[PDB]
């Protein structure tokens, strides 16, 4: 129960890595914080979704 | 026209097999020799093999009105001349054990080959009846050899009022086209009325009932269950081998099998033979009844090529080849099952149930039943896979969907009744010219794989056949 | 509910069909004579039926 | 050069073992092992020496060898064997899984030995020869004699001629299935060369000019219906996939290994070879019905595998489940899913062999094939269960497993190129997971008093344990490190992308 319980987080867990590499390309953490503010000029919806199910 | 030096040449395979009906009927007066008889008809049938290569020295040329000579007739000769010959051999160990006159059978089979390599040459109307009835006399009479069984007789008063009724049939119809049309002469017919197609219909009727079509198979199963095996040889293969060539050379020639009112009801008959002979295959353990089964389904194969023969030139080659390996898979597995009753033992024991084991009692002939019965299938490595191949080919070619689905989903079904037989042969078991007997079909084992394997030789002999 | 597998049966069914119509026309074969000949009657009417109608 | 060779190695073989069957009967077993040793050679040889980090944009014919021969000419057909860079991953997969087949056959002796081993020699050297073809009638040939010789093993061997669901259920599905569809394909390729021969006026059976035949849309579409049919039936797919558990199931475990290991292979490999190059737009169209039917296939196989009661049938029921994601796979237009698709086949066959050697070694240890009867088994066997859990770990998307890297790119390239049909395609996971641990509770966790047959265990010997050994540790590399595989397969993907892009 614990197994089937921690892989259900962990398909959580990697569907916002497929948000994260569709948005903003790299998945290096400083990488990706000095390069999420130059992406995101225009559309924020869909960051929400990443980072909810991130969460 | 005369009788030239060409004609005679022409007309070697008819000379030679002629000779040797009367030397073997006058040798049959003398001594009376079942030696002396079987070597002497062999002998003859080996000097007609011989001969057809004087005839390809010869080109196309016509005899006579009744008859046309072309290479394409020279491998119908062939085939027919090997059938003779495989029948003579598988005899010999069967009537050893015959109690009397057992010297009868060489003179019939001998008739048999004078019809079917007169089958092979046509050109007019009159020559088909010739030589479907010449072959029809000994069948009449050779299913109906060692009548003292119980259903051999049986066996043979059902063929033989049956083959009367369709010789009836079709000369019934050859007449009714012969009214509109001014000759009989296969090119000179044609030159769509209702009165021509409808004699033709009848000679389709009087022709499907030999070619073992969708409404005339009834005879199949039962004089094949009657007939002796040696008989069996015979009546699978050179006989409808014999009388396909001038099914198809009819509608080569005559411009009314152009037109697409005859076309769609063979390819109707075509289309049910396949799925008519397919279903009701699978239940039968019978052996001779299974190989009689499998006769209708594979002249259907053959009909939905000739259907197409009139689009496209591949469709020659087709029917030759899928008549070639049609061949030596027939004679090797009715071989083999003549092969068992290597004594004359009354009624032949064979059933699908007495075939269990096989491979622990004579391992090398259980293997030319499986080679053989694969190759009937469509399985690759085997010469039925590559005519099976043109067929399909023609089918695609001239765009009968339906047809070659028929095929396609044919061969779906039919595959589960070979594959039992063949593995029927590996369950827990529950004289000299024998020897020859065996050479004969394992030589035909040889040739199935080699052929299936390697298929362009063949190919080349029919490409050089071919007009 | 998956205990038996559903589709591998479902697509069985040609099997069943074919075997059930192969056994129903060994039925229809008699080997009366007599029929043999209706059936060459019958295949006869047919067929100048079928070429009537075209 | 070597194609040639290395396609007739397997025919030699079962020539030779059958020659020596009457000079003794050890021989066929030290014989086959050697033979398949040649064969990874030459294909090793092949990875090797040849440049498997070639041009990633040198067209779409590429190949490092090249054989070509007159078969029949009337047709153009050809002996056009040619070898790429993802075609040379399959036969050394094969060549491995051939020795697998090979060894666990060791100390199998019987009435007749030298007949199976020339069979089992015949049909791996089918899956070659399909691996290597380039011309459509040598493809279909080999496509269908790799077919025949399996139905001999289901029959002659899945039980030796005492039950009679060894051949009319079992072996019969799985002729019928695949053959009608092989049919099907056939007259799609003398569809496709007929409206060549209208558009140009040459008989050619090759794959380069066929590539591009001129087509009115609506006539290429029937044609690709036509080869995905042949390509469903071979690898599971949600329509027609019957003929998997039983064969697997019935057939000996050696024998399961060619039917799940690596013919599961070669349809998906005619998807990405095949399918996709000649009939661009029709797949184009053809792609949404592809990913309907790639959910459905991975969802319904993971909740029959978690249904199911025995073991045979419930890894054959991970099959197809596992084959979704790659449908998914190749009907979408991302290298990287491509790419993912690759590792994810190989890990695939790397996984499933283990545990079928694995299942049917338990069987004869025990005697006893129902999962739910035994339990407990931890405290008797020493090393079957332990390696035992880390296939059944490896199979669902565990990390350092091949599986998990596999799955997980086809996964980003899915989601790069379509959001809603990836995003259910990700829970296939958590079913994996509890059919994964159904089959591990219900097989080794519990009490051994769950049947008296649990009770009185047998050892194991060393060579099973040696190959099985080899699979976990490779099975962990391909896992951790499989950067060199897909710098392998890198240009061959790419070709096959851009022409599919590039072409619509």
């Not at chain 2, 007309?11 to 030397?23: A, E, F, H, M, Q």
């Not at chain 2, 049939?169 to 009989?184: N, T």
């Not at chain 4, 009608?180 to 799609?188: E, Q, R």
Request: aromatic share 12%; proline share 4%.
């Amino acid at each position: 129960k614990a197994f089937v319980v921690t892989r259900v987080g962990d398909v959580f867990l990697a569907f916002a890595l497929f948000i994260l590499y569709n948005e903003l390309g790299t998945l290096n953490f400083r990488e990706m914080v000095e390069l999420a503010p130059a992406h995101f000029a225009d559309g924020n919806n869909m960051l929400m979704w990443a980072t909810l199910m991130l969460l | 026209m005369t009788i030239t030096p060409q004609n005679l040449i022409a007309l070697l395979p008819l000379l030679i097999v002629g000779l040797t009906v009367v030397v073997v009927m006058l040798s049959i007066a003398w001594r009376r020799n079942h030696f002396l008889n079987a070597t002497l008809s062999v002998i003859g049938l080996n000097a007609a093999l011989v001969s057809l290569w004087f005839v390809g020295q010869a080109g196309a040329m016509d005899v006579t009105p009744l008859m046309r000579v072309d290479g394409f007739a020279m491998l119908y000769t062939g085939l027919v001349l090997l059938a003779s010959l495989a029948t003579c051999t598988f005899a010999y160990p069967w009537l050893e054990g015959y109690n009397d006159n057992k010297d009868e059978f060489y003179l019939l089979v001998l008739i048999a080959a004078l019809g079917g390599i007169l089958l092979a040459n046509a050109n007019h109307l009159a020559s088909l009846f010739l030589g479907i009835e010449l072959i029809s006399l000994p069948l009449f009479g050779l299913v109906g050899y060692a009548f003292r069984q119980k259903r051999s007789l049986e066996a043979s008063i059902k063929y033989t009022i049956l083959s009367a009724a369709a010789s009836s049939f079709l000369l019934f119809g050859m007449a009714l086209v012969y009214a509109q049309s001014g000759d009989l002469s296969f090119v000179a017919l044609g030159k769509n009325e209702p009165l021509l197609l409808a004699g033709f219909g009848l000679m389709i009727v009087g022709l499907g009932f030999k070619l073992s079509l969708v409404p005339f198979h009834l005879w199949t199963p039962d004089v094949y269950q009657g007939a002796p095996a040696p008989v069996s040889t015979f009546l699978a293969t050179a006989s409808k081998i014999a009388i396909f060539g001038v099914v198809m050379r009819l509608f080569l020639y005559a411009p009314v099998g152009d037109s697409e009112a005859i076309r769609v009801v063979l390819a109707i008959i075509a289309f049910a033979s396949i799925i008519f002979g397919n279903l009701m295959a699978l239940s039968q353990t019978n052996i001779k009844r299974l190989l009689g089964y499998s006769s209708i389904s594979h002249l259907g194969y053959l009909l939905v090529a000739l259907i197409a023969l009139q689009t496209g030139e591949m469709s020659m080659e087709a029917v030759g080849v899928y008549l070639a390996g049609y061949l030596f898979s027939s004679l090797g597995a009715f071989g083999v099952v003549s092969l068992m009753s290597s004594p004359y033992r009354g009624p032949d024991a064979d059933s699908l149930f007495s075939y269990r084991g096989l491979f622990w009692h004579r391992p090398i002939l259980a293997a030319v039943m499986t080679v053989m019965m694969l190759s009937l299938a469509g399985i690759p490595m085997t010469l039925g896979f590559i005519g099976k191949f043109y067929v399909l080919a023609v089918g695609v070619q001239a765009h009968l969907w339906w047809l070659v689905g028929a095929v396609v989903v044919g061969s779906a079904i039919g595959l589960y009744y070979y594959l039992r037989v063949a593995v029927s042969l590996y369950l827990h078991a529950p004289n000299w010219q024998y020897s020859a007997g065996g050479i004969v079909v394992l030589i035909s084992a040889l040739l199935v794989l080699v052929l299936g394997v390697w298929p362009q030789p063949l190919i080349s002999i029919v490409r050089l056949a071919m007009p | 509910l998956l205990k038996r597998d559903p589709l591998n049966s479902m697509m069985n069914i040609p099997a069943v069909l074919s075997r059930f119509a192969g056994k129903g026309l060994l039925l229809s074969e008699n080997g009366y004579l007599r029929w043999y000949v209706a059936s060459m009657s019958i295949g006869a009417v047919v067929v100048l039926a079928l070429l009537m109608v075209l | 050069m070597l194609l040639p060779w290395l396609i007739l190695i397997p025919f030699i073989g079962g020539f030779l073992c059958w020659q020596t069957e009457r000079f003794g009967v050890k021989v066929p077993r030290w014989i086959a092992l050697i033979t398949m040793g040649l064969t990874l050679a030459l294909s090793l040889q092949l990875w090797l020496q040849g440049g498997y980090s070639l041009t990633q944009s040198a067209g779409i014919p590429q190949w490092q060898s090249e054989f070509d021969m007159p078969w029949i000419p009337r047709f153009g057909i050809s002996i056009h064997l040619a070898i790429d860079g993802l075609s040379l991953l399959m036969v050394v997969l094969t060549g491995l899984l051939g020795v697998l087949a090979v060894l666990c056959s060791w100390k199998e002796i019987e009435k007749y030995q030298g007949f199976f081993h020339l069979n089992l020699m015949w049909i791996l050297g089918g899956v070659i020869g399909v691996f290597l073809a380039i011309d459509m009638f040598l493809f279909f040939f080999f496509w269908e004699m790799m077919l025949v010789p399996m139905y001999f093993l289901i029959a002659l061997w899945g039980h030796k001629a005492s039950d009679g669901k060894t051949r009319i259920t079992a072996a019969t599905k799985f002729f019928i299935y695949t053959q009608a569809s092989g049919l099907v394909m056939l007259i799609a390729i003398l569809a496709l060369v007929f409206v060549h021969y209208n558009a140009t006026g040459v008989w050619t059976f090759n794959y380069e000019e066929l590539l591009n035949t001129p087509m009115s849309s609506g006539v290429e579409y029937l044609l690709m219906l036509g080869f995905f049919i042949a390509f469903a039936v071979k690898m599971p797919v949600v329509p027609l996939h019957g003929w998997l558990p039983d064969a697997h199931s019935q057939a000996p475990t050696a024998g399961s290994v060619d039917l799940a290991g690596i013919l599961l292979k070669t349809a998906a490999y005619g998807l990405l070879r095949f399918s996709l190059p000649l009939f661009p737009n029709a797949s184009a169209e053809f792609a949404p019905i592809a990913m309907w039917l790639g959910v459905i296939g991975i969802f319904y196989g993971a909740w029959m595998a978690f249904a199911q009661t025995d073991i045979k049938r419930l890894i054959a029921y991970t099959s197809v489940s596992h084959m979704g994601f790659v449908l998914i796979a190749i009907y979408t237009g991302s290298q990287l899913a491509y790419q993912g698709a690759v590792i994810q086949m190989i890990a695939h066959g790397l996984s499933a062999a283990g545990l079928f050697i694995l299942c049917g070694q338990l069987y004869e240890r025990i005697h006893t094939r129902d999962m739910r009867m035994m339990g407990g088994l931890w405290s008797k066997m020493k090393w079957l269960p332990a390696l035992s859990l880390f296939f059944a770990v490896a199979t669902l998307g565990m990390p350092g497993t091949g599986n998990f890297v596999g799955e997980f790119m086809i996964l980003f390239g899915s989601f790069q190129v379509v959001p809603v049909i990836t995003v259910i395609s990700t829970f296939g996971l958590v079913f994996a997971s509890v059919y994964s641990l159904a089959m591990l509770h219900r097989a080794y966790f519990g009490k051994a008093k769950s049947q008296i047959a649990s009770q009185e265990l047998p050892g194991m010997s060393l060579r099973e344990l040696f190959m099985i050994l080899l699979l976990v540790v490779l099975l962990v590399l391909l896992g951790f490190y499989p950067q060199p595989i897909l710098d392998t397969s890198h240009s061959a993907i790419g070709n096959i992308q851009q022409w599919f892009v590039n072409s619509v």
